């Protein structure tokens, strides 16, 4: 449609943007971030619904940023592609510590799969009985 939105924060040369060709068109508004602050830029600019955050990202500690992300929306699906033991550290540090987790920036095939594994696909979806 068009209302699909995701952020991807990592320092992989062309994975961030290949996610764009991968979803940004039709899958989701997948944007690229070199810092969580850059992700904050887009989260306030385009307001993607999902966030991919790596704290292992050169620049800033994405951990803090993703904490703020749930803190901004609470509907935003905060997904972690950093030290996935942050459901230990990042969670107890603040609030949620991100949901779907991965310790490695992996091949996008598993990522697109993970997207269609985790995403609702239910009846109520987000919060709306009978989409109108």
From Swiss-Prot:
PROSITE patterns, alphabetized: RESPONSE_REGULATORY
Its main localization is cytoplasm
Q: Which cysteines are joined by disulfide bonds?
A: none
Which residues get modified to 4-aspartylphosphate?
A: 54
A GO cellular component term found in this entry reads:
cytoplasm
Q: What are the recorded Gene Ontology BP terms?
A: phosphorelay signal transduction system; sporulation resulting in formation of a cellular spore
Where it sits in the cell: the answer is: Cytoplasm
Which cofactors does it use? Mg(2+)
A Pfam match is Response_reg
Q: Does the keyword Magnesium apply?
A: yes
Q: How is the cofactor bound?
A: Binds 1 Mg(2+) ion per subunit.
Gene3D superfamilies attached to this UniProt entry: 3.40.50.2300
Q: Which InterPro entries match?
A: Bact_response_regulator, CheY-like_superfamily, Sig_transdc_resp-reg_receiver
CDD domains linked to this entry: REC_Spo0F-like
EC number of this enzyme: 2.7.-.-
* MF terms (GO), sorted A to Z: kinase activity; metal ion binding
Record function comment: Key element in the phosphorelay regulating sporulation initiation. Phosphorylation of spo0B during sporulation initiation.
**Protein name per the record:** Sporulation initiation phosphotransferase F
Source organism of this protein record: Bacillus subtilis (strain 168)
């Amino acid at each position: 449609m068009m209302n699909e939105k995701i952020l991807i924060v990592d320092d992989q040369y062309g994975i961030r943007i290949l996610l764009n060709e991968v979803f940004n068109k039709e899958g989701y508004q997948t944007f690229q971030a070199a810092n969580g602050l850059q992700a904050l830029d887009i989260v306030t600019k385009e307001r993607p619904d999902l966030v991919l955050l790596d704290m292992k990202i050169p620049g800033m500690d994405g951990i803090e940023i993703l904490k703020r992300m749930k803190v901004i929306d609470e509907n935003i699906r905060v997904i972690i592609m950093t030290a996935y033991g942050e459901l230990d550290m990042a969670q107890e540090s603040k609030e949620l510590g991100a949901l779907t987790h991965f310790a490695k920036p992996f091949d996008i095939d598993e990522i697109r799969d993970a997207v269609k594994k985790y995403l609702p696909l239910k009846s109520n979806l987000e919060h709306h009985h009978h989409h109108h």
